[PDB]
Tab-separated table of C-alpha atoms in Angstrom:
chain	number	residue	atom	x	y	z
Y	1	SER	CA	-38.293	17.093	79.866
Y	2	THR	CA	-35.780	14.296	80.808
Y	3	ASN	CA	-33.457	13.823	78.006
Y	4	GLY	CA	-33.339	9.986	76.332
Y	5	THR	CA	-30.159	10.226	74.918
Y	6	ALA	CA	-29.484	7.102	72.761
Y	7	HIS	CA	-25.380	6.357	73.866
Y	8	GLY	CA	-23.044	5.301	74.112
Y	9	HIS	CA	-22.393	2.742	74.674
Y	10	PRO	CA	-25.406	1.509	76.936
Y	11	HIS	CA	-25.112	4.535	79.569
Y	12	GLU	CA	-27.823	6.709	77.585
Y	13	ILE	CA	-29.137	3.283	77.138
Y	14	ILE	CA	-30.588	3.966	80.535
Y	15	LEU	CA	-31.621	7.190	80.304
Y	16	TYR	CA	-34.655	6.150	78.419
Y	17	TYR	CA	-36.065	4.791	81.475
Y	18	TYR	CA	-37.431	8.278	81.667
Y	19	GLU	CA	-38.824	8.312	78.690
Y	20	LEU	CA	-42.497	6.465	77.875
Y	21	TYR	CA	-41.167	3.884	81.470
Y	22	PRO	CA	-42.121	3.058	84.784
Y	23	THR	CA	-41.296	-0.683	84.243
Y	24	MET	CA	-39.287	-1.228	80.068
Y	25	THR	CA	-36.001	-1.785	82.232
Y	26	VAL	CA	-36.911	-4.401	84.909
Y	27	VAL	CA	-38.257	-6.724	82.645
Y	28	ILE	CA	-35.227	-6.230	80.329
Y	29	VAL	CA	-33.482	-6.941	83.622
Y	30	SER	CA	-35.358	-10.056	84.023
Y	31	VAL	CA	-34.204	-11.350	80.429
Y	32	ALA	CA	-31.014	-10.624	81.192
Y	33	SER	CA	-31.519	-12.715	84.215
Y	34	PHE	CA	-32.844	-15.667	82.136
Y	35	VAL	CA	-29.628	-15.425	79.662
Y	36	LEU	CA	-27.690	-15.935	82.500
Y	37	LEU	CA	-29.465	-18.920	83.550
Y	38	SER	CA	-29.215	-19.926	80.271
Y	39	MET	CA	-25.466	-19.601	80.355
Y	40	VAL	CA	-25.254	-21.390	83.679
Y	41	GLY	CA	-27.040	-24.182	82.177
Y	42	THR	CA	-25.100	-24.790	79.700
Y	43	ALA	CA	-21.951	-24.585	81.532
Y	44	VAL	CA	-23.360	-26.697	83.770
Y	45	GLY	CA	-24.526	-29.269	81.179
Y	46	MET	CA	-20.754	-28.919	79.628
Y	47	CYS	CA	-19.511	-30.241	82.999
Y	48	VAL	CA	-21.405	-33.046	82.640
Y	49	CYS	CA	-20.571	-33.759	79.310
Y	50	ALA	CA	-16.988	-33.194	80.257
Y	51	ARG	CA	-17.701	-36.250	83.213
Y	52	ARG	CA	-19.158	-38.225	80.012
Y	53	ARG	CA	-16.109	-37.780	78.018
Y	54	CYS	CA	-13.641	-38.682	81.142
Y	55	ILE	CA	-16.066	-41.578	81.751
Y	56	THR	CA	-14.587	-44.772	80.619
Y	57	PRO	CA	-11.520	-43.216	81.170
Y	58	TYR	CA	-11.868	-44.180	84.307
Y	59	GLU	CA	-11.324	-47.960	84.653
Y	60	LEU	CA	-8.495	-47.846	83.710
Y	61	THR	CA	-5.239	-47.459	83.254
Y	62	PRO	CA	-2.479	-46.447	80.934
Y	63	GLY	CA	-4.360	-44.018	78.415
Y	64	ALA	CA	-4.389	-40.781	79.890
Y	65	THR	CA	-3.416	-38.735	81.324
Y	66	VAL	CA	-2.338	-38.707	77.528
Y	67	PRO	CA	-5.500	-37.124	76.917
Y	68	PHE	CA	-4.871	-34.935	79.587
Y	69	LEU	CA	-2.570	-33.111	77.158
Y	70	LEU	CA	-5.586	-32.472	75.015
Y	71	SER	CA	-7.902	-31.744	78.052
Y	72	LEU	CA	-10.452	-29.970	78.887
Y	73	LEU	CA	-8.810	-28.977	81.454
Y	74	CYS	CA	-10.655	-31.889	84.087
Y	75	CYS	CA	-8.707	-34.452	82.208
Y	76	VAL	CA	-5.443	-32.307	82.690
Y	77	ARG	CA	-6.302	-32.101	86.205
Y	78	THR	CA	-6.658	-36.174	87.193
Y	79	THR	CA	-3.824	-36.714	85.208
Y	80	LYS	CA	-3.256	-37.772	89.595
Y	81	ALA	CA	-0.056	-40.850	90.542
O	1	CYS	CA	-5.398	-61.379	96.169
O	2	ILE	CA	-9.497	-62.402	96.904
O	3	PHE	CA	-11.397	-60.645	99.402
O	4	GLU	CA	-14.802	-61.165	100.770
O	5	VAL	CA	-17.920	-58.526	100.145
O	6	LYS	CA	-20.067	-58.588	103.372
O	7	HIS	CA	-23.341	-56.978	103.520
O	8	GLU	CA	-25.179	-57.412	107.444
O	9	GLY	CA	-22.628	-59.451	108.280
O	10	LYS	CA	-22.998	-61.988	105.379
O	11	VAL	CA	-20.704	-62.783	102.355
O	12	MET	CA	-22.381	-61.633	99.266
O	13	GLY	CA	-19.501	-62.356	96.181
O	14	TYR	CA	-15.846	-61.204	96.298
O	15	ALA	CA	-13.601	-58.468	95.740
O	16	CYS	CA	-10.271	-58.967	93.738
O	17	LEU	CA	-6.647	-57.665	93.173
O	18	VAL	CA	-5.863	-57.879	89.992
O	19	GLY	CA	-2.976	-56.063	87.462
O	20	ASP	CA	-3.068	-52.599	90.176
O	21	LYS	CA	-6.513	-52.153	90.475
O	22	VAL	CA	-9.153	-53.681	92.737
O	23	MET	CA	-11.921	-55.477	91.193
O	24	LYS	CA	-15.720	-56.630	92.530
O	25	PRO	CA	-18.405	-56.670	90.649
O	26	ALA	CA	-20.738	-53.936	90.271
O	27	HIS	CA	-24.242	-56.141	91.218
O	28	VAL	CA	-22.562	-57.149	94.681
O	29	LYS	CA	-24.126	-55.406	97.599
O	30	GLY	CA	-21.807	-54.764	100.703
O	31	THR	CA	-18.397	-53.549	101.475
O	32	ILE	CA	-15.222	-55.561	100.727
O	33	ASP	CA	-14.293	-57.226	104.384
O	34	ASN	CA	-10.504	-55.274	104.710
O	35	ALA	CA	-10.137	-51.480	106.173
O	36	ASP	CA	-7.400	-50.709	103.476
O	37	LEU	CA	-9.800	-51.499	100.693
O	38	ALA	CA	-13.291	-50.841	102.438
O	39	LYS	CA	-11.910	-47.051	102.229
O	40	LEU	CA	-10.998	-46.814	98.790
O	41	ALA	CA	-12.764	-45.007	96.264
O	42	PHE	CA	-14.657	-46.729	93.415
O	43	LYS	CA	-15.237	-46.253	89.507
O	44	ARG	CA	-18.507	-47.853	88.795
O	45	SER	CA	-18.965	-49.101	85.022
O	46	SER	CA	-22.807	-50.468	84.686
O	47	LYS	CA	-21.451	-51.489	80.751
O	48	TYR	CA	-19.519	-54.036	82.617
O	49	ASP	CA	-21.149	-54.442	85.824
O	50	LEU	CA	-17.226	-53.521	86.948
O	51	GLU	CA	-16.496	-51.604	89.792
O	52	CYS	CA	-12.651	-51.471	90.104
O	53	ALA	CA	-10.327	-49.372	91.815
O	54	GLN	CA	-6.111	-48.588	92.462
O	55	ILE	CA	-4.290	-51.236	94.944
O	56	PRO	CA	-2.658	-49.316	98.281
O	57	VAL	CA	1.031	-49.930	97.354
O	58	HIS	CA	1.165	-52.033	100.642
O	59	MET	CA	-1.150	-54.419	99.148
O	60	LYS	CA	0.079	-54.415	95.127
O	61	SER	CA	2.481	-56.968	96.020
O	62	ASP	CA	-0.450	-58.775	96.701
O	63	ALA	CA	-1.959	-58.017	93.152
O	64	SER	CA	-2.451	-61.332	91.055
O	65	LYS	CA	-1.471	-60.650	87.008
O	66	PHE	CA	-3.084	-60.447	84.417
O	67	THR	CA	-2.842	-61.513	80.916
O	68	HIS	CA	-4.490	-61.497	77.413
O	69	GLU	CA	-2.578	-64.977	76.864
O	70	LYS	CA	-5.345	-67.744	76.579
O	71	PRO	CA	-4.774	-70.418	74.215
O	72	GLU	CA	-7.321	-73.163	73.751
O	73	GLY	CA	-7.540	-75.840	76.790
O	74	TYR	CA	-8.187	-75.748	80.658
O	75	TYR	CA	-7.985	-72.773	82.937
O	76	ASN	CA	-7.695	-73.089	87.304
O	77	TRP	CA	-10.830	-71.735	89.203
O	78	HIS	CA	-11.887	-72.187	92.512
O	79	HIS	CA	-14.382	-75.003	91.570
O	80	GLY	CA	-12.753	-76.657	89.180
O	81	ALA	CA	-10.887	-76.158	85.819
O	82	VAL	CA	-12.706	-73.962	82.903
O	83	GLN	CA	-12.456	-75.075	79.960
O	84	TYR	CA	-11.265	-72.588	77.057
O	85	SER	CA	-11.734	-72.935	73.089
O	86	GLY	CA	-13.980	-71.243	70.564
O	87	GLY	CA	-13.285	-67.878	72.476
O	88	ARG	CA	-15.733	-69.141	75.096
O	89	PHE	CA	-14.945	-70.377	78.396
O	90	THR	CA	-17.376	-72.886	79.690
O	91	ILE	CA	-17.896	-75.634	82.916
O	92	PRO	CA	-19.849	-78.843	83.744
O	93	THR	CA	-23.345	-77.369	84.770
O	94	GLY	CA	-24.068	-76.984	88.225
O	95	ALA	CA	-20.780	-76.324	89.286
O	96	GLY	CA	-21.021	-72.306	89.204
O	97	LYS	CA	-23.947	-70.604	91.052
O	98	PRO	CA	-24.797	-67.106	92.247
O	99	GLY	CA	-22.308	-65.386	94.396
O	100	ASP	CA	-19.683	-66.669	92.698
O	101	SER	CA	-19.028	-63.091	90.565
O	102	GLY	CA	-15.602	-61.655	90.967
O	103	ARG	CA	-13.803	-64.911	91.122
O	104	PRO	CA	-10.577	-64.903	88.721
O	105	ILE	CA	-10.164	-67.766	86.541
O	106	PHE	CA	-6.496	-68.177	86.532
O	107	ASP	CA	-4.084	-70.246	84.267
O	108	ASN	CA	-1.135	-72.708	85.074
O	109	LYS	CA	0.969	-69.714	86.089
O	110	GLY	CA	-1.339	-67.700	88.259
O	111	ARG	CA	-1.940	-64.942	85.653
O	112	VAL	CA	-5.557	-63.620	85.944
O	113	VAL	CA	-7.300	-64.337	82.656
O	114	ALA	CA	-11.315	-63.495	83.121
O	115	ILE	CA	-13.108	-62.564	86.013
O	116	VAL	CA	-16.541	-64.135	86.501
O	117	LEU	CA	-19.639	-62.315	86.071
O	118	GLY	CA	-22.316	-64.692	85.337
O	119	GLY	CA	-23.589	-67.665	83.176
O	120	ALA	CA	-25.986	-69.208	80.603
O	121	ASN	CA	-26.794	-72.047	81.053
O	122	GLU	CA	-26.989	-74.331	77.501
O	123	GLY	CA	-27.304	-77.938	79.204
O	124	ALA	CA	-24.525	-80.463	79.759
O	125	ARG	CA	-22.207	-76.873	79.576
O	126	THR	CA	-22.295	-73.513	81.196
O	127	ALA	CA	-20.856	-70.697	78.773
O	128	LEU	CA	-19.327	-68.246	81.726
O	129	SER	CA	-19.634	-64.527	81.275
O	130	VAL	CA	-16.538	-63.050	81.703
O	131	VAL	CA	-14.049	-60.142	81.606
O	132	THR	CA	-11.578	-60.450	79.774
O	133	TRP	CA	-7.697	-58.826	78.621
O	134	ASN	CA	-7.547	-57.798	75.249
O	135	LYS	CA	-4.592	-56.877	73.221
O	136	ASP	CA	-4.033	-54.322	76.582
O	137	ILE	CA	-7.615	-53.084	77.147
O	138	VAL	CA	-10.470	-54.832	79.136
O	139	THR	CA	-13.736	-56.432	77.558
O	140	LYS	CA	-16.546	-58.339	78.393
O	141	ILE	CA	-17.637	-61.558	76.849
O	142	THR	CA	-21.868	-62.443	77.518
O	143	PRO	CA	-22.799	-65.549	76.187
O	144	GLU	CA	-26.736	-65.128	75.177
O	145	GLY	CA	-28.919	-66.001	77.877
O	146	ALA	CA	-26.455	-65.333	80.430
O	147	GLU	CA	-28.241	-65.314	84.635
O	148	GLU	CA	-25.646	-62.800	86.355
O	149	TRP	CA	-24.035	-64.770	89.079
U	1	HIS	CA	-49.084	9.730	68.631
U	2	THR	CA	-46.961	7.617	68.294
U	3	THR	CA	-46.479	5.924	72.046
U	4	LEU	CA	-46.411	2.008	71.227
U	5	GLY	CA	-44.886	-1.121	72.234
U	6	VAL	CA	-41.633	-2.081	71.277
U	7	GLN	CA	-39.743	-3.027	70.334
U	8	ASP	CA	-37.965	-0.600	67.933
U	9	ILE	CA	-34.173	0.771	66.936
U	10	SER	CA	-31.744	1.352	70.287
U	11	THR	CA	-31.702	-0.910	67.038
U	12	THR	CA	-28.633	-1.974	65.413
U	13	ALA	CA	-26.283	-0.746	68.877
U	14	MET	CA	-29.022	-3.149	70.732
U	15	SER	CA	-28.422	-5.915	67.880
U	16	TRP	CA	-24.632	-5.493	68.540
U	17	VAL	CA	-24.921	-6.659	72.210
U	18	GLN	CA	-27.630	-9.199	72.076
U	19	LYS	CA	-25.957	-11.065	69.407
U	20	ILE	CA	-22.858	-11.637	71.584
U	21	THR	CA	-25.373	-13.767	74.164
U	22	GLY	CA	-26.830	-17.163	73.217
U	23	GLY	CA	-24.378	-17.469	70.204
U	24	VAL	CA	-22.350	-19.758	72.713
U	25	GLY	CA	-25.763	-21.396	74.509
U	26	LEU	CA	-26.027	-23.146	71.294
U	27	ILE	CA	-22.222	-24.403	70.173
U	28	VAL	CA	-22.175	-25.898	73.804
U	29	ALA	CA	-25.809	-27.803	72.731
U	30	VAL	CA	-24.411	-28.747	69.568
U	31	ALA	CA	-20.994	-30.323	71.118
U	32	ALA	CA	-23.196	-32.282	73.737
U	33	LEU	CA	-25.122	-33.682	71.210
U	34	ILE	CA	-22.138	-34.920	68.977
U	35	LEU	CA	-20.695	-36.276	72.325
U	36	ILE	CA	-23.924	-38.126	72.900
U	37	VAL	CA	-23.542	-39.442	69.297
U	38	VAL	CA	-19.731	-40.413	69.851
U	39	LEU	CA	-21.012	-42.206	72.929
U	40	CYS	CA	-23.546	-43.943	70.943
U	41	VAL	CA	-20.878	-44.636	68.397
U	42	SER	CA	-18.774	-46.649	70.981
U	43	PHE	CA	-21.868	-48.364	72.317
U	44	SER	CA	-22.283	-49.534	69.079
U	45	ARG	CA	-18.970	-50.354	68.808
U	46	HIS	CA	-18.753	-52.842	71.929
P	1	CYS	CA	34.195	-47.217	90.795
P	2	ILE	CA	32.069	-46.865	94.035
P	3	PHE	CA	32.907	-44.600	96.255
P	4	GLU	CA	31.648	-43.014	99.664
P	5	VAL	CA	29.996	-38.916	100.292
P	6	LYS	CA	31.160	-38.190	103.724
P	7	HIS	CA	29.114	-35.449	105.835
P	8	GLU	CA	30.588	-34.066	109.099
P	9	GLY	CA	33.152	-37.573	108.813
P	10	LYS	CA	29.819	-39.893	108.539
P	11	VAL	CA	28.994	-41.702	104.990
P	12	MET	CA	25.587	-40.285	103.812
P	13	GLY	CA	25.423	-41.737	100.135
P	14	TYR	CA	27.666	-42.757	97.547
P	15	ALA	CA	29.118	-41.792	94.197
P	16	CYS	CA	30.011	-44.095	91.249
P	17	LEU	CA	32.134	-43.861	88.107
P	18	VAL	CA	29.396	-44.781	85.363
P	19	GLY	CA	29.956	-44.694	81.403
P	20	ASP	CA	32.647	-41.158	81.654
P	21	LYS	CA	30.940	-39.399	84.143
P	22	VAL	CA	31.184	-39.549	88.199
P	23	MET	CA	27.496	-39.877	89.528
P	24	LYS	CA	26.117	-39.029	92.937
P	25	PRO	CA	22.808	-38.344	94.183
P	26	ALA	CA	22.021	-34.523	94.471
P	27	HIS	CA	20.123	-35.086	97.855
P	28	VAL	CA	23.556	-36.253	99.812
P	29	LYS	CA	25.267	-33.958	101.586
P	30	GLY	CA	29.048	-34.398	101.964
P	31	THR	CA	31.526	-34.638	99.801
P	32	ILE	CA	33.056	-37.856	97.659
P	33	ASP	CA	35.993	-39.214	100.016
P	34	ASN	CA	38.659	-38.733	97.569
P	35	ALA	CA	40.595	-35.499	96.387
P	36	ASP	CA	40.736	-36.713	92.459
P	37	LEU	CA	36.734	-36.296	92.890
P	38	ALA	CA	36.368	-34.241	95.517
P	39	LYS	CA	37.594	-31.266	93.719
P	40	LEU	CA	35.722	-31.411	90.671
P	41	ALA	CA	33.624	-29.140	89.272
P	42	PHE	CA	29.933	-31.055	89.552
P	43	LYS	CA	26.310	-30.095	86.826
P	44	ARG	CA	23.428	-30.500	89.320
P	45	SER	CA	20.326	-31.425	87.914
P	46	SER	CA	16.743	-31.490	90.391
P	47	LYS	CA	14.445	-33.273	87.978
P	48	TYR	CA	16.702	-36.315	87.981
P	49	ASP	CA	17.858	-35.193	91.541
P	50	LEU	CA	21.259	-36.254	89.851
P	51	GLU	CA	24.650	-34.688	90.149
P	52	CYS	CA	27.184	-35.489	87.438
P	53	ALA	CA	30.875	-34.709	86.523
P	54	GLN	CA	33.393	-35.882	84.301
P	55	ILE	CA	36.043	-38.461	85.316
P	56	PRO	CA	39.470	-37.654	85.227
P	57	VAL	CA	41.771	-39.445	82.601
P	58	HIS	CA	43.638	-41.129	85.629
P	59	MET	CA	40.711	-43.020	86.877
P	60	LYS	CA	38.247	-43.236	83.570
P	61	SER	CA	39.965	-47.167	83.006
P	62	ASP	CA	37.790	-47.102	86.724
P	63	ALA	CA	34.533	-46.359	85.132
P	64	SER	CA	32.151	-48.637	84.971
P	65	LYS	CA	30.029	-49.166	81.846
P	66	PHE	CA	25.143	-49.541	82.649
P	67	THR	CA	22.632	-51.232	80.549
P	68	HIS	CA	19.304	-50.987	79.864
P	69	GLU	CA	18.417	-54.328	79.852
P	70	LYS	CA	16.885	-55.801	83.256
P	71	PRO	CA	14.949	-59.036	82.651
P	72	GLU	CA	12.517	-59.671	85.649
P	73	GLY	CA	14.956	-61.903	88.004
P	74	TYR	CA	17.178	-61.223	90.537
P	75	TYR	CA	20.002	-58.076	90.892
P	76	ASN	CA	22.880	-57.782	93.222
P	77	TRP	CA	23.475	-55.184	95.772
P	78	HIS	CA	25.672	-54.409	98.642
P	79	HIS	CA	22.999	-55.855	101.666
P	80	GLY	CA	21.819	-58.915	99.529
P	81	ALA	CA	19.519	-59.720	96.309
P	82	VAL	CA	16.628	-56.654	94.753
P	83	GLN	CA	14.218	-58.369	93.068
P	84	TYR	CA	13.406	-57.427	89.765
P	85	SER	CA	9.308	-57.993	88.240
P	86	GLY	CA	5.943	-55.809	86.733
P	87	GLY	CA	8.880	-52.814	86.385
P	88	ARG	CA	9.816	-52.356	89.825
P	89	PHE	CA	12.864	-53.748	92.342
P	90	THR	CA	12.072	-54.413	95.373
P	91	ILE	CA	13.528	-56.194	98.848
P	92	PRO	CA	12.698	-57.451	101.865
P	93	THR	CA	12.073	-54.580	104.437
P	94	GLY	CA	14.567	-53.776	106.930
P	95	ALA	CA	17.521	-54.630	104.361
P	96	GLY	CA	17.868	-50.939	102.771
P	97	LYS	CA	17.897	-47.802	105.357
P	98	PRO	CA	18.570	-44.275	105.329
P	99	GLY	CA	22.239	-44.009	104.203
P	100	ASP	CA	22.052	-46.345	101.333
P	101	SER	CA	21.042	-44.091	98.577
P	102	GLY	CA	23.416	-43.839	96.045
P	103	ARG	CA	24.576	-47.459	96.046
P	104	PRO	CA	24.064	-49.237	92.704
P	105	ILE	CA	22.335	-52.470	91.816
P	106	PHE	CA	24.452	-54.493	89.769
P	107	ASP	CA	23.307	-57.213	87.489
P	108	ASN	CA	25.766	-61.017	87.441
P	109	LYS	CA	27.935	-59.550	84.952
P	110	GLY	CA	28.840	-56.027	86.708
P	111	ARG	CA	26.566	-53.877	84.902
P	112	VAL	CA	24.725	-51.291	87.423
P	113	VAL	CA	21.175	-51.264	86.326
P	114	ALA	CA	20.047	-48.844	88.634
P	115	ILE	CA	21.108	-46.604	91.515
P	116	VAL	CA	18.943	-46.271	94.813
P	117	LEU	CA	17.342	-43.061	96.159
P	118	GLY	CA	14.963	-44.173	98.488
P	119	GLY	CA	12.427	-46.643	98.698
P	120	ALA	CA	8.552	-46.678	99.640
P	121	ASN	CA	7.444	-49.341	102.839
P	122	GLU	CA	4.500	-51.357	101.299
P	123	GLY	CA	5.086	-54.174	103.806
P	124	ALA	CA	6.890	-57.369	103.410
P	125	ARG	CA	8.628	-55.854	100.653
P	126	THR	CA	10.030	-52.180	100.016
P	127	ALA	CA	9.862	-50.876	96.421
P	128	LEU	CA	12.856	-49.244	96.004
P	129	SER	CA	12.533	-45.599	94.045
P	130	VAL	CA	15.893	-46.005	91.665
P	131	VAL	CA	17.608	-44.070	88.995
P	132	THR	CA	17.440	-46.244	85.828
P	133	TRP	CA	18.528	-45.842	81.840
P	134	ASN	CA	15.638	-46.138	79.810
P	135	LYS	CA	16.310	-46.863	75.461
P	136	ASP	CA	19.568	-44.754	76.049
P	137	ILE	CA	18.615	-42.149	78.751
P	138	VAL	CA	18.278	-42.019	82.442
P	139	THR	CA	14.944	-42.085	84.026
P	140	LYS	CA	13.371	-42.616	87.653
P	141	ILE	CA	11.327	-44.644	88.910
P	142	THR	CA	9.848	-43.678	92.428
P	143	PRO	CA	7.439	-45.914	93.826
P	144	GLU	CA	4.274	-44.577	95.591
P	145	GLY	CA	5.216	-43.121	98.975
P	146	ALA	CA	8.783	-43.483	99.057
P	147	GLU	CA	10.884	-42.600	101.807
P	148	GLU	CA	14.147	-40.958	100.598
P	149	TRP	CA	17.196	-42.931	102.303
């Protein structure tokens, strides 16, 4: 019965759920959530690294700005004033 | 230019208005005993044991210069005369004690030349561990075996 | 007959989308390490 | 070389004949109190808060040349002596009020060195916000918290 079409794109992807199932999709969703967490963790780490770069230049005087802008954004926005 | 850091109503160290920043050693506990200065946002720097911020426009006239220019000879500081030579500031051992960090070493024209952080005792004289300006950028000279004041 | 645990196909297509995610994570991890390396260079320079 | 901008019969700022142009701060309300100058066509420039035009041939002999050359020391202005140092012009607070914009800061040889736009009060002294010449090009220095006069 229930037709488990291929795609596409995705669409027909969720159709398979009906075919062999209870489960399947939930586990995939959990995996997606884990991937999102990894993506979020990376971003958080990147922002902390961006601070690590901006450090030194935090004390302090003529010398960027410049950096700035090249600056990721934050650089710049301290640079102010 | 010199302002005192107080902690539980007790002077711990000092803060100084050098260049266009407001300095005070990072290790000093307390808060600058000056409204305008106390409410500022300082940027700590554990390498230099420094903790600077920017001087409010209404006090910028109160800063003390600075300068990279420091020829061998004698410099001035609160306890007397510092001696510079061989790329090292020194003083008669005993004339500098814990609680002297933050105190500037002026020259004869008033330009701040370095800021004391501590000193290493090497007998008759103690080699100071200071924060000094290079060509343009800040630097920190710490003699072997310094005792952070 | 057949009924078994994947994964399987729908293969290809599935890989197309999967390949898009995680690469950027590797990039920012490498960049993080490189920033640390440069930081250590500065520490050595001082 | 100096001419006054009047508004509803009241002096608001000034206009100056520098180089071969006729200057007056853009923010100043009124019209130059001089027939020849008033009927001119000015080109506004909001970045520089400047508003220049060209000096009529019959007044070109009346212009004032300017200069980028400004060594630390004292300069001259209508209310007294301005002080230059640390890349900042200052004066005793109170000696400059709203309605002083446009007034030039001359040196001892008469060369216009900067043109006052306003000032920031930083206590004893006020850091002026001026229009000054660089290597060749115009520039504007505005101390933190300036009050546009």
